[PDB]
Enzyme design. Structure first.
Site, PDB file in Angstrom:
ATOM      1  N   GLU A  77      -5.038  29.910 -62.464  1.00 51.48           N
ATOM      2  CA  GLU A  77      -3.741  29.339 -62.823  1.00 51.48           C
ATOM      3  C   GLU A  77      -3.848  28.366 -63.996  1.00 51.48           C
ATOM      4  O   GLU A  77      -2.954  28.325 -64.848  1.00 51.48           O
ATOM      5  CB  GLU A  77      -3.099  28.675 -61.602  1.00 51.48           C
ATOM      6  CG  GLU A  77      -1.678  28.136 -61.812  1.00 51.48           C
ATOM      7  CD  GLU A  77      -1.635  26.711 -62.323  1.00 51.48           C
ATOM      8  OE1 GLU A  77      -2.600  25.966 -62.068  1.00 51.48           O
ATOM      9  OE2 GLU A  77      -0.649  26.344 -62.991  1.00 51.48           O
ATOM     10  N   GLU A 150     -12.250  25.146 -69.588  1.00 51.50           N
ATOM     11  CA  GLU A 150     -11.419  24.605 -68.524  1.00 51.50           C
ATOM     12  C   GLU A 150     -12.121  24.627 -67.171  1.00 51.50           C
ATOM     13  O   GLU A 150     -11.804  23.806 -66.303  1.00 51.50           O
ATOM     14  CB  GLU A 150     -10.088  25.355 -68.490  1.00 51.50           C
ATOM     15  CG  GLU A 150      -8.962  24.561 -67.868  1.00 51.50           C
ATOM     16  CD  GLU A 150      -7.612  25.185 -68.144  1.00 51.50           C
ATOM     17  OE1 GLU A 150      -7.580  26.320 -68.664  1.00 51.50           O
ATOM     18  OE2 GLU A 150      -6.587  24.510 -67.922  1.00 51.50           O
TER      19      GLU A 150
END
EC number: 3.4.24.-
Length: 966
Positions: A77, A150
């Site tokens: 996500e 990330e």
């Protein structure tokens, strides 16, 4: 002619853009109609709630059922919002935040589902945001470097020096570090893990720090190809916009490019235990007690049926509210007033986030020796509830409360609906049965009318005879985080030792390319966008009538379609109040409707409030004047809500509060003050930037000083000081003084919002109530450091500017939002690493800079100085000015609920003429006006600055003599 009538015109079996109408139900109690559709080729389910509300909302949901503690859906996500094929720019989410007329745009990842909701009011903007969300979620470029930046990677402390050792870096990795530091997250997660040890609820779905580096790029792409597939998706839209446009956009942009898969992701039922269990876990110490060490939390949890069988879940949820909500509940009277602990345990009451719901009760802040005492208390209370049952008035209060929640008109209704049905829908339930609330109420009333001891058999069945009981205790250990650091560093060294020199040069080159990716500003001109011609030039005028009544109180009536509700507001000034008693006003507002009135004890008073109203609250507000920086009005806003039939009873309650409040009931007051002090101490991180700006803004205007007194950090520290006093009686004597200075009709104004059909009866009840009741500052610089035991910083910088009605104000507002979109976001967030950072201009005239979870201190203020130098440089185009105008007009035109239309005239005294003048002033803002206003107010030496810091110890800040340390 209407939208909901055509939404009732949808017939069964119609094929619409590849979708098939499967079910049509009218929900007259909510003025909306549910329609269930399924896509023939993909199998994606569609639920639309059509209701005549212009704030249209879309949401899409994906079922993610992890089978390990790697944290793959949370990172997926996070990574899917970083770029897509058709929109290769980085972070479409934030880029569309300044190119749309949305009021909400975010995403959530629960334990077993991911949710992507947004809401907006313009159909072309709806097409825009729906297209960007479809292409971002279903077709992202799954670049490996996004996964290394990330997620997880091995990286040197300086990526250019290949001789220093390797460490872990990553967004989700440090998010799980910060989740693991959170004691409540350990408690909630381990509670779910121990109670549900069989399946996906036994792992940390957000990511276990010991299991996170096992995730590969290949696993990330395989998980994305298997789980972010439209056959594993549930689309949901709400509002008045035509469905055909939505269905046509979904089919022509996303669903055609995929083919059918079948997710093997159904979560099986948890196997019931034969015997209750006990477990002991550990968390991180806090600053409450060393030698006594009362920081021990204990809980007792019970397994409940599934959320699929809607009725039994609705019944048990009401039962848990009867057991835990308010001082009239059994567990409050037994546990809270026992003086053994400090508050209820986390996840208290009904928790329906898992497949099988569960009930939890317990306390936090107890001594560890009392664990078996608490367990015996819980069992003994279950015995007493079986033997004595519930009174009928509390059942009526709960049914009136749930019904009033059904009819209430909020501004974010669709978001509450999707959050209320997401959990049930995720486990293949029928979401329409959670919507037919009237039927569940009718069946509830009938099932109580047939068996008066039904709830005693329910409490017996699910609590005294429930063999799936878990008692879980937590005690802190001094040697915990270093043990965790040892094992994490050991996993690091074992992962580092097997790496070859070719791997080290691969790390070096990947690190340098990642730094270039993090530094180079990229282009976002591939996104579709609206223009200023799509912004409405004029607003519809709001009709008001002010009636002076009995004999000098102005009363404002606003006819609105409030759906049978009366919303009463009153604002009483405090200009006669002694200045010494000012800081205890918020406390007074928080306890005024909780201490008893007349012949009513606090138990009966709380029962009456829940039985007649939907809640009655008081909160202090400071309303600045719009034509003088040094003029403000200080007062208390009394707010209430009731159905139209309980209005004379509500005004009888209000008269009883105003004429004979019981300020002598001391024990429940001591309980409430320790509970609010705990709640404010628990809420510092989530509103840290607000507390930082409010302390930072104290020294510019008297209104800032009053906002500091009512809601700054001084209020929390003072409340803790009062909660540490052993004799509360001299503090309790101050409340009749507030009653005698504030509860009269000398400086009062009131408001009533109701249906026009109900309005004369409301005018009668209010006039009866009103006849029944008694009768040069110079800003100066301040630098402040709050030493907080946080891992991150919160800094605030304020600059004094013009008020609302000055023509330069609209230009300054455009400039502030412009700076936020095009400088501060990249500099603080992408470079710095903070989760939030920007610029804001308040209505009173304060230009405020803020930081949220920022790892730096000095570099942030230096970035603020470079932002003001950027503003003087003028290096922005006219399209950037259009983008900033789009964002500001997206902010000022946010939808207002019927209960606050119009509240702004009642509070701040701004007419629609002033709003139209300011709207045309925002229209007239030009590029040269922005450079002129930048050299007139934001330049160095032109205004007074103010500084404040929330955060841990930093030696470099401490050696600055111009800072005051708190």
């Amino acid at each position: 002619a209407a939208a909901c009538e055509r939404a009732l015109q949808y017939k069964l079996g119609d094929k619409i853009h590849g979708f098939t109408v499967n079910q049509v139900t009218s929900v007259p109690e909510l003025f909306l109609t549910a329609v269930k559709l399924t896509h023939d080729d993909t199998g994606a389910r569609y639920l639309h709630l059509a209701r005549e509300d212009t704030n249209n909302l879309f949401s899409v949901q994906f079922r993610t059922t992890p089978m390990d503690s790697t944290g793959v859906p949370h990172i997926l996500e996070h990574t899917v919002l970083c770029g897509s094929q058709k929109y290769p720019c980085r972070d479409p989410f934030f880029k569309m935040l300044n190119r749309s007329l949305s009021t909400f745009m975010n995403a959530f990842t629960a334990s077993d589902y991911t949710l992507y909701p947004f809401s907006t009011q313009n159909p072309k903007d709806f097409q825009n945001l729906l297209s960007v969300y479809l292409d971002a979620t279903f077709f992202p470029c799954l670049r490996e470097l996004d996964f290394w930046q990330e997620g997880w990677r091995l990286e040197h402390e300086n990526p250019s020096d290949p001789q220093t050792p390797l460490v872990f870096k990553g967004v989700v990795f440090n998010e799980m570090k910060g989740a693991f530091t959170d004691n409540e997250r350990i408690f909630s997660q381990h509670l779910q893990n121990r109670l549900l040890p069989d399946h996906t609820y036994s792992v940390v779905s957000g990511g276990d720090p010991l299991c996170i580096p096992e995730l590969t790029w290949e696993q990330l792409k395989q998980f994305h190809a298997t789980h972010y597939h439209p056959s594993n998706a549930r689309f949901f839209t709400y509002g008045n916009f035509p469905l055909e446009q939505h269905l046509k956009q979904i089919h022509e942009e996303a669903l055609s490019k995929f083919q059918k898969i079948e997710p093997s992701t159904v979560v099986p039922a948890q196997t019931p235990w034969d015997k209750p269990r006990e477990f002991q876990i550990t968390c991180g110490p806090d600053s409450f007690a060393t030698d006594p060490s009362k920081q021990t939390t204990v809980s007792v949890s019970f397994l409940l049926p599934d959320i699929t069988d809607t009725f039994e879940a609705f019944t048990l949820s009401l039962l848990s509210s009867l057991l835990t909500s308010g001082p009239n509940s059994p567990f409050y009277k037994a546990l809270i007033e026992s003086g053994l602990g400090t508050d209820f345990s986390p996840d208290v009451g009904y928790n329906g986030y898992t497949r099988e719901a569960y009930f939890s009760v317990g306390l936090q802040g107890i001594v560890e020796k009392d664990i078996e005492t608490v367990r015996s208390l819980i069992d003994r209370t279950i015995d007493e509830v079986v033997e004595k049952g519930f009174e009928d008035d509390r059942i009526e209060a709960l049914l009136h409360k749930i019904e009033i929640q059904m009819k209430h008109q909020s501004t974010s209704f669709g978001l509450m609906l999707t959050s209320y049905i997401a959990s049930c829908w995720n486990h293949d339930g029928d979401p329409v049965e959670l919507l037919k609330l009237g039927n569940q109420l009718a069946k509830f009333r009938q099932c109580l009318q047939e068996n008066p001891k039904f709830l005693q058999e329910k409490v017996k069945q699910y609590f005294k005879n429930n063999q799936h009981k878990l008692t879980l205790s937590m005690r802190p250990d001094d040697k915990y985080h270093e043990k965790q650091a040892q094992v994490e560093a050991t996993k690091l060294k074992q992962k580092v030792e097997a790496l070859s020199p070719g791997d080290r040069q691969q790390i070096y080159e990947k690190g340098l390319e990642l730094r270039s990716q993090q530094s180079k500003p990229q282009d976002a001109s591939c996104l579709p966008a609206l223009k200023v011609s799509d912004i409405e030039p004029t607003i519809p005028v709001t009709e008001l009538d002010v009636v002076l009544t009995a004999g000098d109180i102005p009363v404002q009536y606003c006819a609105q379609p409030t759906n049978g509700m009366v919303y009463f507001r009153a604002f009483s000034s405090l200009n006669t109040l002694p200045e010494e008693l000012r800081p205890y006003v918020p406390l007074f507002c928080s306890v005024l409707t909780k201490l008893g009135c007349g012949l009513l004890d606090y138990r009966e008073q709380a029962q009456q409030i829940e039985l007649k109203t939907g809640g009655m609250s008081a909160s202090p507000h400071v309303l600045p004047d719009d034509s003088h920086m040094d003029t403000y009005e200080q007062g208390v806003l009394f707010s209430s809500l009731c159905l139209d039939r309980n209005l004379p009873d509500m005004m009888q309650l209000w008269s009883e509060i105003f004429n004979n409040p019981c300020f002598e009931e001391e024990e429940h007051f001591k309980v409430l003050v320790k509970m609010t002090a705990q709640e404010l101490a628990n809420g510092i991180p989530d509103s840290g930037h607000l507390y930082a700006s409010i302390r930072a803004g104290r020294t510019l205007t008297p209104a800032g000083d009053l906002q500091e007194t009512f809601s700054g950090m001084d209020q929390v520290r003072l409340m803790k000081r009062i909660a540490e006093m052993t004799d509360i009686k001299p503090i309790l004597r101050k409340l009749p003084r507030i009653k005698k200075h504030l509860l009269n009709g000398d400086n009062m104004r009131c408001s009533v919002n109701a249906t026009p059909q109900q309005m004369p009866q409301t005018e009668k009840a209010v006039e009866d109530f009103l006849r029944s009741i008694g009768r040069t500052f110079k800003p100066w610089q301040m630098k402040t450091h709050f030493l907080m035991p946080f891992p991150v910083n919160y800094v605030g910088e304020c600059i004094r500017t013009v008020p609302y009605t000055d023509p330069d104000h609209a230009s300054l507002k455009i400039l502030a939002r412009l700076m936020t979109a095009k400088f501060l976001h990249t500099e603080i967030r992408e470079k710095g690493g903070a989760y939030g950072g920007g610029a804001k201009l308040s209505h009173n005239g304060i230009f405020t800079l803020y930081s949220y979870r920022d790892p730096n201190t000095i570099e942030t203020l230096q970035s603020f100085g470079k932002a003001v130098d950027w503003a003087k440089s003028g290096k922005f185009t006219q399209q950037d000015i259009d983008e900033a105008k789009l964002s500001v007009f997206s902010t000022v035109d946010a939808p207002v609920a019927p209960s606050d239309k119009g509240m702004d005239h009642f509070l701040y005294g701004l007419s629609d003429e002033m709003k139209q003048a300011h709207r045309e002033q925002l229209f007239a803002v030009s590029h040269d006006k922005l450079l002129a206003v930048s050299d007139r107010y934001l330049g160095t030496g032109k205004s007074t600055h103010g500084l404040a810091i929330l955060g841990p110890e930093n030696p470099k800040i401490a050696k600055d003599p111009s800072w005051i340390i708190r």
